[PDB]
Symmetry: C5
Subunit: 311 residues, 5 copies
């Protein structure tokens, strides 16, 4: 009901911990993720302490209204952290052990440049408002911060749940206070993405390259233009998986390069035909023969240039 008084000017230390139970709804369209976890809080209140003989027990259980509880909030959430309280335990020395289970949609930006190899740092920002009586400071209890054996992250590898031990104060408000950051490092699992996106997209492009082993302009126009359609169609097919980014992505640059290669292949096919029709088939045959090596080499070279630029 009333905040604990400081014996001295020192601020109240609230030890925090988050135990990740379930992580669902990874909607990449809104750069959000839903979380279901345990939030543990630990701080010392002298007013609740006792001798354990006359009191009988070693522990004292209270209701949330009965005692003072710090106003802990999450910064980067859609709406107020949905909560329910599990337990409040007071040890003989006056140390309060608070535990609640919560579920909330977290706002955490995603970098899609490295995609689909990309690594992400998912953030959960904890915050406390200091009162006049008293100031309150947050701390991390590493024993209460953990991932379960049943933790499921389908399509991602969980690297480190290591929260920011030194979380800098956000100078947003009039009074600056330290906001405890929880860094959750993940890296994209990619096996499926080669046989489902890259490989079939390379096959369609390679099919267009058969126009370099043909002399029929009609058959060549069909090869290049119809594969171009198949490529667009294939992009529409995988559209859901690829990201809608306002910046240039690695995947996006490859896609653009593929569009350029269809254009150049058309030029070649058109040129080869023009030379043959304009009575110089020696040149026409030489260009086509060269393209057979030029196109794969330049492609492989440019992909290495791209890979280097992004990694």
């Amino acid at each position: 009901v009333s905040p604990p008084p400081p014996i001295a000017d020192e601020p109240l230390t609230v030890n925090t911990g988050i135990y990740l139970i379930e992580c669902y709804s990874l909607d990449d369209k809104a750069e959000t993720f839903k979380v279901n976890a345990f939030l543990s809080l630990s701080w010392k209140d002298r007013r609740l302490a006792f001798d354990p003989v006359r009191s009988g027990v070693r522990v004292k259980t209270y209701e949330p209204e009965a005692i003072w509880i710090p106003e802990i909030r999450f910064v980067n959430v859609e709406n107020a952290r949905d909560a329910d309280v599990v337990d409040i335990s007071v040890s003989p020395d006056g140390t309060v052990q608070y535990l609640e289970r919560f579920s909330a949609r977290v706002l955490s930006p995603l970098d899609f440049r490295r995609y689909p190899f990309d690594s992400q740092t998912l953030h959960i920002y904890l915050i406390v408002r200091s009162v006049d009586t008293r100031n309150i400071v947050l701390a991390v209890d590493l024993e209460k911060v953990g991932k379960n054996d049943d933790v499921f992250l389908t399509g991602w590898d969980i690297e480190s749940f290591t929260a920011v031990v030194k979380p800098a104060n956000f100078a947003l408000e009039d009074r600056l206070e330290s906001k405890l950051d929880y860094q959750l490092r993940i890296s994209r699992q990619y096996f499926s993405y080669i046989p489902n996106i890259i490989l079939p997209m390379l096959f369609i492009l390679f099919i267009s390259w058969t126009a370099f082993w043909s002399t029929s302009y009609e058959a060549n126009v069909t090869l290049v233009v119809s594969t171009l359609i198949a490529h667009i169609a294939f992009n529409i097919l995988v559209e859901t998986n690829l990201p809608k980014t306002p910046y240039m992505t690695y995947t996006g640059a490859i896609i653009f390069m593929i569009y350029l290669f269809y254009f150049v292949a058309v030029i070649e096919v058109t040129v080869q035909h023009y030379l043959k029709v304009e009575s110089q088939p020696a040149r026409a045959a030489s260009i086509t023969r060269a393209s057979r090596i030029a196109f794969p080499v330049v492609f492989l070279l440019a992909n290495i240039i791209l890979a280097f630029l992004f990694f």
Copy 2:
């Protein structure tokens, strides 16, 4: 009111039951499903026992606030279930019969590898928090576990609603307690998936194979490339039914293999033409003649390899 006191150290047994009335919203994307069911609770409270002559009746009806009710919760739900109590009945010996109708979105992972023959185990995890006075344990009353004669599961076969009789304790919290698991085993119905997905997808691939019974390179390019487009288009058409998985699925491997076969068929068509144009039609004719058997045989062989790998 207050919790019932133990005659001895033994924990309070709360007998549970779930009567599955309706199952709506089967989201193959979020791996969540909405449920509307009856939850029944049974436990013995000596405090409310009576003689039926002086009391007149054989049964006593109470309001939820009037008596003690165990705090039963679901583990794998987005948020707390809809709480609408139906009836509370007390027998002369003190046995309480609780019944509520609830509705909640359940988080249950789905394995799409064996799809569309795939079988699933849907989970509903029940949990109770033990108090200081007396510890509380959950049990399954098989007579109160059921699904109606009007239970509709369009597209699935319900194998067994048999809940985990021995549900292991989840070591997540500070105090470990047994969490009653409800395993709902289902198997996918496919009487439609062959004529609607597989058969037309095989037809389009087979059409490309007619290029082995033709010598017109122009007609062949049209056959292979236009069927490749029809295949992509067909995939777009059925896209909704197929799953967007970060791992490799059986269906997904077949699709990939089909993409490979279009690529190889192009190679053949291109090779056949090159040999004919490079004045060796004997080889060209032999390759084409071989492909007529090679392509179906290798396909049938590789499908058997795939089926074996996944089953």
Copy 3:
């Protein structure tokens, strides 16, 4: 307040009525429909009766809390209906007239086999919980069951709003009681489905059949394969209208048959060409000439077989 007492053992009859206002959000995909209607309740309470001279008036108006009201619920809802009470009127003899306006999403399975001629029986299940003092039974007041002159059902014909006069008890609960069923029989209006789905889908198939009046294998491959693409594309176009069913539908069987016909047409075209190239144009010409009649006849025959099988 308290429930009315029975003069004899007879159960309390609650006369019900539903006045269907506007029906919205006909989600064919979730097999749910939203309803906005008036619910009327009528039952006799001797406890509320009076003489109209000393009381002055002929009618007595109460608030919902002031008097006893039966706990009427709907069986098949996503979650409980919106609760808005309009009026409560008591006649001199004690007859209570209750009226509320409600809105709820109803779960009602749909049969898509006969689609798009398909007829449906939409269900709204009313239910009441019978009390230890008096058993409560539901009845239908046909004078209070109706639909307005402004009732709109776009693309459906409303056959009969006739509710189940003898609604069987659901043996789900421990105590079985009669649950008042409201059957709304509807039949699909198709004045659009022929010119928008069937006719253009037949035209595309007929275009492929022109390959039987041509000898150019190149032109024929283009005809059959490009129309096959147009068919897939057309299916994608109308995909929204067609149903995603795990069982075999009439429409779905026709679609499958059309896919088969494109495959057979390819075979013919391929065969005709092979015979001509393998120096037997007499056979090639005979098969093509036969196909001109065979394909339409077999199609028309198989459609009548299909129509017969489904109707």
Copy 4:
């Protein structure tokens, strides 16, 4: 708290007004539209009046619970509106000025036949329930009915916001009362619909007509069939804009006619070829020459027939 008493038998007049601030979510599918507006209510209560000298002020501000407020509801809404009261002001004579801001989904049928020239009458039905003490009637204060300078109706022309001055009583309930209708007459802006839908759809059809100036059956098959695909593809592209109607629309009839023209064009192309191959090129040339005029003329004629039928 209590209703104002009538000096005489006359009913209480509640003057209404709706100030349309922002109209969003124009859902074409469900024929619903979301609205955010101000609702103003004006009625005279003598019990709240005063002298302004002894009271000091000219205006008196109350809280909704403090005074009597009429139970105003909307008929055609998904569910009850948003209850956010802005201000309640009482003038010295006792005239109450009520203002609330609300947001609700309105059910209003749309006629898509005339589309995209189509005109609509959007309805918002206001209703009040008369009490036993004094009957309540609704009125329209034209000075409080309006739309801002910042009112956004992107794609429509607002013809008249003129609410039904004489709104007939809905004979649905047992007691009939006048329900104040708000007619919002709008007409569709088509600045864009010609260059974005009609013109490109005519271009694709016209391209197919070039087959009448060619003799190459191969080139003709490509022209007709590939444009047919382009048409389907184009329909898929504009799918969002076009309406999903269970009845026949003007736009829908044109689309169907276009499908018929592709079929007839195929027939011509097939016939022309057959005659040439069956050694009668004089007839073949005459039909093709005629089609060059026949197709555009018949099209233009049939479009005039269609336009006449719908307008």
Copy 5:
């Protein structure tokens, strides 16, 4: 509890400030954007003032219920702002410092004509209701208005967060009062829109222009018509990025012009062929030779005309 009294007739000045923390869910479809920010309020009340020696402290902290707080609301929002308060501080002179954190969906129209060079003026309208005792006016405290060093907007450049210093009164209500406007000027970053939309769309069009360097009518029909399909397909692919506008946009005019160019290119190809077949290949060759320059020149000229018209 009560509105602060004016020493003279002057209105109460409430100094406002908005500190933009996070800006998410930029759903262009509904022309809405979600905002998460700090709202600061500053005004002087003499009743809360004190001497700081006898009171001890320099600052006084209150609870929202304890003191009078102005009813500040947002005009253009889907629903009410999140009701969450951070701090209330009173200085020795009586100056109140209010701070709250809020999250709401804002309705702000978007102009898509200049897209994707488009620039926008985003609006957040603040409003206050004046009471009987003293009229309340809003002001902007520039020192309490800003965005963090970590604020980043994906795809946009933030030009000026300069709120309307002179915000005109909205004449909607009976009593007109100044509504404080917050203008946020932004310009779209297009670094992606050229390589992802424009460039590949130009490539497909350029491919059709190779028909001017060919004499094969068959190959030309394939070139023009198949690229036209690729264009439609490409539009379907990028459909998400392009806006669904009922007015004419810059991007939309370019798209229309591209459709026209495919039609004209067909005409050329058809004409070239007709002249050759009608035994005048000198004219046919001249037209084709001219088109090689005419088409790119006219295109580049018309694009400059378009750019000029829109900018």
